[PDB]
Design an enzyme around this catalytic site. Structure first.
Site, PDB file in Angstrom:
ATOM      1  N   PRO B   1     -19.722 -32.721  -7.728  1.00  0.00           N
ATOM      2  CA  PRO B   1     -18.843 -33.903  -7.896  1.00  0.00           C
ATOM      3  C   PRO B   1     -19.409 -34.953  -8.870  1.00  0.00           C
ATOM      4  O   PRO B   1     -20.629 -35.001  -9.057  1.00  0.00           O
ATOM      5  CB  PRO B   1     -18.704 -34.519  -6.496  1.00  0.00           C
ATOM      6  CG  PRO B   1     -19.890 -33.967  -5.718  1.00  0.00           C
ATOM      7  CD  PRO B   1     -20.225 -32.628  -6.356  1.00  0.00           C
ATOM      8  N   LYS B  32     -22.720 -32.105  -0.306  1.00  0.00           N
ATOM      9  CA  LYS B  32     -22.817 -31.172  -1.450  1.00  0.00           C
ATOM     10  C   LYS B  32     -24.278 -31.161  -1.869  1.00  0.00           C
ATOM     11  O   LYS B  32     -24.987 -32.131  -1.631  1.00  0.00           O
ATOM     12  CB  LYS B  32     -21.888 -31.614  -2.587  1.00  0.00           C
ATOM     13  CG  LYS B  32     -20.415 -31.729  -2.222  1.00  0.00           C
ATOM     14  CD  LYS B  32     -19.683 -30.402  -2.186  1.00  0.00           C
ATOM     15  CE  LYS B  32     -18.189 -30.528  -2.417  1.00  0.00           C
ATOM     16  NZ  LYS B  32     -17.542 -31.273  -1.313  1.00  0.00           N
ATOM     17  N   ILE B  64     -13.280 -30.484  -8.321  1.00  0.00           N
ATOM     18  CA  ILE B  64     -12.307 -29.450  -8.782  1.00  0.00           C
ATOM     19  C   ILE B  64     -11.120 -29.361  -7.805  1.00  0.00           C
ATOM     20  O   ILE B  64     -11.348 -29.346  -6.602  1.00  0.00           O
ATOM     21  CB  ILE B  64     -13.037 -28.110  -9.010  1.00  0.00           C
ATOM     22  CG1 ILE B  64     -14.158 -28.261 -10.040  1.00  0.00           C
ATOM     23  CG2 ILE B  64     -12.075 -27.003  -9.426  1.00  0.00           C
ATOM     24  CD1 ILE B  64     -14.943 -26.993 -10.269  1.00  0.00           C
TER      25      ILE B  64
END
Lengths: 109, 108, 109
Positions: B1, B32, B64
């Site tokens: 991200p 993440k 995404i």
């Protein structure tokens, strides 16, 4: 389309005229007319890429509706890495390229 | 991200190493890996958040296809406010967090 | 909604209070309360718009879901062009406007 380069290189270390070379570079890479190719460069920013504040550049490419296929984007990214690494003297591992779609865009007059 | 922080505080008034700490805060809050979290900070800007040009910060979060649910986006926000209020010396009512999706990205 | 203006003009040539006046005009033009309108100005950048280094300004508008219909977006654009040429002393052919949707946004309590 629209190319936005954010970098943590200071401005006095970012080559002069990059914005226009980059502009011409994209046109032939993307199959766009260079009259449709719009470039913004923002230097002296604070950035971390992979948990590292070593010199790095981030290139955003924005277009209407769809920016490209996954295959056309990888292939285009390759040519963008070749170009910026030579232009900025950064290792390819310090260059990022993101894509996002736009809803529309209008030039005046 | 990707996390982009836009603020009207000059660089002299932004703690050294925000981009790095910001980067480890984001990995753990979003869950993440830290090698996939990329951070830009752009200071010295002219900003009006809710008609007021008093010190303020806009944090844009991108990833995404989708970034999060309504619930995950508000939960994730509450965490970012606690970090950013302390780090920038700002009120929570002077912090704005926007989420927008990406088609793709690639590092070299 | 959010308004991002990038310009190659240095800050001394951007009128003082531009970020306040632009929020007030956004509200009236897009038809949104002024509490909900958010402006960022980034000047002193290196830009090339329609393949030229001459003074320019791209404005980026972004609300959640869909910013507008083509029709309402065209009409809104025409009002923004009216505003930024008189404020920035550029011609319409050096002002560009982009629309992209957002997923979510939240202000602190």
């Amino acid at each position: 389309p629209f190319l936005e380069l954010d970098t943590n290189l200071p401005a006095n270390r970012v080559p002069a005229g990059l914005e226009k070379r980059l502009c011409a570079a994209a046109a032939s890479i993307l199959g766009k007319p260079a009259d449709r190719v719009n470039v913004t460069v923002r230097p002296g920013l604070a950035m971390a890429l992979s948990g590292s504040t070593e010199p790095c550049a981030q290139l955003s490419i924005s277009s209407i509706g769809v920016v490209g296929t996954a295959e056309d984007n990888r292939s285009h990214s390759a040519h963008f890495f070749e170009f910026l690494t030579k232009e900025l003297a950064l290792g390819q591992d310090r260059i990022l390229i993101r894509f996002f779609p736009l809803e529309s865009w209008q030039i005046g007059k």
